[PDB]
Amino acid sequence: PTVFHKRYLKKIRDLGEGHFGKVSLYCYDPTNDGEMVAVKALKADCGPQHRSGWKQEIDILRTLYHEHIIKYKGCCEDQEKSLQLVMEYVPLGSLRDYLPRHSIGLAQLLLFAQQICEGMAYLHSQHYIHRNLAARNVLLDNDRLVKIGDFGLAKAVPEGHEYYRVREDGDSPVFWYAPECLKEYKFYYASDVWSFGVTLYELLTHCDSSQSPPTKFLELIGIAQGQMTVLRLTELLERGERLPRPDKCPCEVYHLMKNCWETEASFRPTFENLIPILKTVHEKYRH
């Protein structure tokens, strides 16, 4: 029932450096005696009705619940032609910022991966694709539980269809994307698994920038971060080239990543399949 009024939100601090756009930590103290929340300011000068249509769409995300998916709390308009999106505050933040500055063993990294899969399996079973699964978008709470964030690309998959058709050739996170996404503009549940493979790669490199997928992929092609084309990447992937085995990364775990990187969407493992395979692997490496 909670509706959020701009007159009871006191700004504490910016969040995420700049990597999530303009997100800030607020205190919500209405009665003046208060909960902590993150607020995303969203430019929405697109005509009043288009703006409402986006609110309706965002609002539907609130009907999702899973402990490894961030909780979107509400979407208010500032009619200043912008939308204010209120969500739970996830205090340790992004794995991309967290993993470099903390000692985290193989068992714990595998535990993160199983949590992500569990949140993604739920999402898939609710008939949604995420389209933006990367380590930057996986947040960590205080008990080191994963919460998947940034649903700014998420989409309901239409009844009777096994893919969503991406329109628009815009800013794409291409280095996390399956070839069917890159070439044909089709996004399947199986395409989110490809992105998982890349996220798994990320964790096991400890989100080391120099081993990062854009860095690595540009090197395997040859040319620099500026001459880069989707076409050049697609061809490399078809020829069967892949991101390399990360340092100290077990061969069964790498094979996992490679299974997520099968060219043919249909032969990739499902999240629901990946959960137990990751439970089993984590058991070998715990304690």
Size of the site for ligand TZ1 (CB under 6 A): 18
Q: Concatenate the DSSP letters of all residues of 196-237 into one string.
A: HHHHHHHHHTTT-GGG-HHHHHHHHH-S-TTT--HHHHHHHH
Regarding 98 and contact with ligand TZ1 (CB under 6 A), the answer is no
- Here's the x/- map for ligand TZ1, 21-60, by CB under 6 A: it reads as --x--------------x-x-----------------x--
Among 44, 69, 86, 87, indicate the residue that binds ligand TZ1 (CB under 6 A): 87
Regarding 93 and contact with ligand TZ1 (CB under 6 A), the answer is yes
Regarding 202 and contact with ligand TZ1 (CB under 6 A), the answer is no
96: nearest Cα among 122, 133, 71, 151: 133
Tokens read off for 43: 């430019």
* Residue 195: count of CB within 10 angstroms of its CB: 25
CA–CA separation, 261 and 190 (whole Å): 10
Among 4, 89, 217, 254, indicate the residue that binds ligand TZ1 (CB under 6 A): 89
Among 151, 163, 177, 201, indicate the residue that binds ligand TZ1 (CB under 6 A): 151
Regarding 149 and contact with ligand TZ1 (CB under 6 A), the answer is yes
- Here's the x/- map for ligand TZ1, 104-143, by CB under 6 A: it reads as -----------------------------------x----
258: nearest Cα among 245, 277, 270: 245
SS3 239: coil
CA–CA separation, 21 and 132 (whole Å): 15
Q: Name which of residues 57 to 86 contact ligand TZ1 (CB under 6 A).
A: 58, 70, 85
Regarding 253 and contact with ligand TZ1 (CB under 6 A), the answer is no
CA–CA separation, 122 and 272 (whole Å): 9
Q: How far is CA 169 from the centre of its chain?
A: 20
Closer CB to ligand TZ1, 62 or 242, in the complex: 62
Regarding 188 and contact with ligand TZ1 (CB under 6 A), the answer is no
Among 9, 16, 164, 206, indicate the residue that binds ligand TZ1 (CB under 6 A): 16
Q: Concatenate the DSSP letters of all residues of 43-80 into one string.
A: E--S-HHHHHHHHHHHHHGGG---TTB--EEEEEEE--
Closer CB to ligand TZ1, 89 or 217, in the complex: 89
Contact residues: ligand TZ1, CB under 6 A? 15-16, 20, 23, 38, 40, 58, 70, 85, 87, 89-90, 93, 139, 149-152
